[PDB]
Amino acid sequence: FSPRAVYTSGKASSAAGLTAAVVRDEESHEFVIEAGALMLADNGVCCIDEFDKMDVRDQVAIHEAMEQQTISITKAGVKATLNARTSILAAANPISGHYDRSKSLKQNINLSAPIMSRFDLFFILVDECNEVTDYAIARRIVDLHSRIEESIDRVYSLDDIRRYLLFARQFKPKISKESEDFIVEQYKHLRQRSWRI
Amino acid sequence: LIIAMKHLNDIYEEEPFNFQMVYNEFQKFVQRKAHSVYNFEKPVVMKAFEHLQQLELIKPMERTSGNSQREYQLMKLLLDNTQIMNALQKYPNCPTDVRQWATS
């Protein structure tokens, strides 16, 4: 849907390939910077699949671009800072592939604390055996397989959604005082109660 | 309390239990729900557990007293899952929340 989207797999990506790399130019006999996925996804969205399989050495490199929105390189006499204004969408599974209810929630996710902290939305999906859900899923899948086009009812066109999103993104709303004190009290209540807030 | 006991028996296959684990997971159930009217303190739940033990649906293992309190005592259930389901089906005024928690 989004033309400014980049997709990547977990293990196949190295630390250099994500942010940037320092490579010697053949003709100039000097050192230059080859761009990584994050800086190519500038002002876009970057999707990572199987985030768990990534090594810690790669996630620690991601750390800076996650929060400070920029990436700094100080390697081999090359000093630079680059913009990494990206939104990260990560996909993963729990430890051993199954959510074991015999263990605590914290023990079911093998992720570092800052990484857990730096995601705004963290959704966990649990699969259950229910007959009505099974019937709905089966009928949807078979209907899609048999009736490819006539089984699609879209309220608005994808191009219309794109145009509306482009028009809407340029507005900058202001925060009202009522919204201000409502946010204050809501955060009071929320913080007064693993994934620390 | 019985539904919590069944969940404990399912999660931990054929192992005993005590009052504290049941209380903790009952607290978990009542805290996940936003504002349900089940705000009860420890003593009333303790009395309910004592009554349940009095009706002899729960029996101690390797009985002793003084050394071990009523708390921290290894209890076991004397019922089957299908019996609980069948009895709950005929319950007169079972609320929706407890029924769905039992199904879950």
Q: How far is CA A50 from CA A9, A92, A113, B16, in A?
A: 6, 5, 18, 39
Tally Cβ neighbours within 10 Å of residue B39.
7
**Hey, which bits of A36-127 come out as E strands?**
45-49, 70-75, 78-83, 87-90
* Residue A93 annotated as binding site: yes
DSSP SS3 for A82: strand
Query: What pairs with residue A74 in β-bridges?
Result: A79
Q: In whole angstroms, what is the distance from residue A147 CA to residue A156 CA?
A: 20
Pairing between β-strand A87-90 and β-strand A78-83 as defined by DSSP bridges: unpaired
Structural contact between residues B74 and B12, judged by C-beta atoms closer than 8 angstroms: no
What is the interface size between A and B, counted as CB pairs within 8 Å? 4
Q: In whole angstroms, what is the distance from residue B97 CA to residue B93 CA?
A: 12
Structural contact between residues A90 and A51, judged by C-beta atoms closer than 8 angstroms: yes
Question: Which chain A residues are Cβ-neighbours of B11 within 8 angstroms?
Answer: 101-102
Q: Are A101 and B11 an interchain contact pair (Cβ–Cβ within 8 Å)?
A: yes
Q: How far is CA A39 from CA A71, A82, A171, in A?
A: 9, 8, 25
Residue B70 tokens, joined:
């009523």
Residues of chain A whose beta carbon is less than 8 angstroms from a beta carbon of chain B are 101-102, 128
Structural contact between residues B84 and B2, judged by C-beta atoms closer than 8 angstroms: yes
Q: How far is A130 from chain B (nearest CA, A)?
A: 10
Residue A29, by phi and psi: left (phi above 0), alpha (psi -120 to 50) or beta?
Answer: left
Q: How far is B66 from chain A (nearest CA, A)?
A: 32
Structural contact between residues A31 and A80, judged by C-beta atoms closer than 8 angstroms: no
Resolution (A): 3.8
Which residue in chain A is spatially nearest to B11 when comparing CA positions? A102
DSSP SS3 for A44: coil
Residue B13 tokens, joined:
């296959």
Question: For A154, phi and psi rounded to 5 degrees?
Answer: -105, 125
Question: For B85, phi and psi rounded to 5 degrees?
Answer: -65, -45
Helix (H) or strand (E) holding A20: strand A20-24
Closest CA to A88 of A123, A54, A42, A21: A42
Residues with Cβ within 8 Å of B61's Cβ and at least 6 positions away in sequence, in order, are B16, B74, B75, B76
Closest CA to B18 of B39, B33, B4: B4
Residue A95, by phi and psi: left (phi above 0), alpha (psi -120 to 50) or beta?
Answer: beta
